[PDB]
Design a protein around this ligand. Structure first.
Ligand SMILES: *[C@@H]1O[C@H](CO)[C@@H](O)[C@@H](O)[C@@H]1NC(C)=O
Ligand SMILES: *[C@@H]1O[C@H](CO)[C@@H](O)[C@@H](O)[C@@H]1NC(C)=O
Lengths: 185, 185
């Protein structure tokens, strides 16, 4: 059963050598690209939160790029995500996607930057097919820990949104995964 | 298939109304009861770490008690653990077992106090049968998050030991779960 590659909004497969906006299936109010923001309650000296805009009628998202364990970007395979933007050089670290510590208010972990590439921690995601339209992101935190009788001894979860100060904040959810598309820039 | 009850070192089942030492199968140097200590690098104002002693030839453990979702203490069922000791009343909270945030050095989560009873977070454990001798503790953190295709959509892990400042610190492990016995006091 051959690994299936993830495609952009043009059919053309996903390339490590290129940058993409993670854009929303949902249209208008129901849409808004993923971007890099500052968490309302973060002590980080850089923007460290992963949000989507509240409508698609405003700014484009922040270009991300993907980093497989492989050579190519496939469905259902661990990878790193990283905002692909020039930074002031305190924040030079705060571009790699990561899943945070458990947040008691939201009872889930939230997406943030400050992650690492190549390492077995909280910085691994999966692209997969939505059960509805397009693609879902997964977060597979704790790759170093045997998740008992789980697929491949690995804990993974769907990536959705919670509302944090009236902004859409990507977080691990149980229902309504964010369905997304990748759009080269 | 009827729920199996967890028994102490006397055959008598485990009772919410009683206190137990979590003691080690291993003898001598290989033994040492679970106890309540202060983490070498904790900012907590109370002792907040779960350790076992380095030999069984020293002090007895700290009595814990168990708190089922049920009425009775069974194998393979979520429960809370709490040190059962009189406290100075800052620390009155710092007796309920909990699993910490991911620790990058050890690449796992560590056992600490500061947990809560009854709530869907990081304070849930399971008693089960060791694959070798006696009982293993499990930690099922993140009960609020759908662990995809995992048993009951729940991430669980074995509880073992790492060495933190030369003391034995209970933590989520992959191999060598701590095999234990419960001994009423
Ligand atoms: C991108 O750049 C390197 C340069 O050698 C190529 O080998 C190529 O395999 C990499 N991947 C793609 C999709 O271009
Ligand atoms: C302990 O105390 C209460 C008092 O009513 C009893 O109902 C009993 O069911 C509880 N459980 C055990 C094992 O004694």
């Amino acid at each position: 059963p051959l690994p299936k590659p993830v495609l952009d909004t043009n059919g053309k497969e996903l390339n490590p050598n290129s940058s993409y906006r993670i854009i929303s299936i949902g249209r208008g109010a129901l849409g808004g690209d993923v971007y890099l923001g500052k968490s309302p309650n973060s002590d980080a000296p850089c923007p460290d939160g992963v949000f989507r805009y509240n409508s698609d009628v405003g700014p484009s998202g922040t270009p991300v790029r993907f980093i497989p364990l492989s050579t190519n970007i496939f469905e259902d395979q661990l990878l790193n995500i990283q905002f692909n933007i020039p930074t002031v050089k305190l924040c030079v670290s705060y571009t790699i996607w990561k899943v945070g510590n458990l947040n008691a208010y939201f009872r889930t972990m939230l997406l943030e930057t400050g992650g690492t590439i190549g390492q077995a921690d909280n910085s691994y995601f999966k692209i997969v097919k939505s059960s509805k339209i397009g693609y879902n992101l997964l977060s597979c935190p704790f790759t170093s820990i045997i998740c008992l009788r789980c697929p491949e001894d690995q804990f993974c979860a769907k990536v959705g949104v919670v509302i944090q100060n009236g902004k859409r904040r990507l977080a691990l959810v149980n229902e309504n995964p964010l369905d997304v598309l990748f759009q080269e820039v």
